[PDB]
């Protein structure tokens, strides 16, 4: 499992469940094209992505729907989504977690990487 | 002015300078247009984007640079920029202010939204 | 100032008035000692708690009421409040802004440190 | 298990490993009184603190020693330590996992509350 996205709400202090995830790749003319996508578990986490071999080289985004996950709880929002883009095993293969904390106007994300 | 953006960097406590901003929106057929550009003061301050008049309904896009600010620091960070996409002035007229917080393998960004 | 302190609310996207901040010194035998109190403003500031007379070097508490603040909107929040401990002025006199940014269940704070 | 803590590094891109850890109680004429101490393991977890019988309803204070790891890799940091207060088991017994994200000149803290 080289990718993995861990989601949390700071409003109830609890993961936050079904809250849809997609993934893209760069493509050489410079657009985006789809790459995996899911949803959230009971726990805030999302596996299963991907593979070792199909996990290249390469700049990738994966794009969190915190527009929708509000609206579900009746809060208003600020952002239409939260975003991060990265380039992936410039060194060798490693393990990538995205972490993301979440208010209805402030977000923040960080990444975990391991061998 | 209705839109400001403010820059600080983690690491020092300190505003962070000459940092790259471009601003877009998304027209009628659902692409792009560019809207605005600058670079942050000593202050870590980017005032002047547009006007009241210029700044009408819509779907914004704010990118950061934040890639070239650590690599002329010697460090090689984990994202290739901050990007920041939200509604505007869809219940009438408001001031936005954009801040942004860095560290090399993490970022935070708050909206500060007034009422003139 | 020599010392300024900033809170927001990252729910509303506002900031927080009436807010209340109590600071301390530690004496030479190890206790707290009070240093100075006030309320935020409608712009979420505090200024003038010191002069740069008095806040010579030393260890520095900062206590802001948090929990009065979301008992106010109806809200019981996680934290009892929040508490930034630090060593000011050790290579000589500075400047600083001690934000902090509040949610029911989380806060972050960051030191902005100047010198004029 | 009904206390847990966790902690991650924004510099590195890694957990804090080998950061010391103290929980406190307050007493009846309002000081802090000792109650728990460890380190983080290679995952940046602490485990084992106390058990559901011992847990009773106070008010609780956990102090992380973070200019010690700062100093640890030779990086300068602001803060003498990083602290979280908060009462506990006011509605009946919960499972708490106190979250921690840190820089050198700005730190977050989250709470996680389980059944």
Known sequence: CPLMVKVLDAVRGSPTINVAVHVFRKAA???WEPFASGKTSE???LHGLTTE???VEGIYKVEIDTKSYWKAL???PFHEHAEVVFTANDSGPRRYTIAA???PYSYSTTA????
Chains 1, 4 share one sequence.
């Open 29 to 31: 003319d410079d657009t």
């Open 43 to 45: 726990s805030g986490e």
């Open 53 to 55: 071999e199909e996990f």
């Open 74 to 76: 009746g809060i208003s």
């Open 101 to 103: 904390l979440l208010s």
């Open 112 to 115: 975990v990487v391991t061998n």
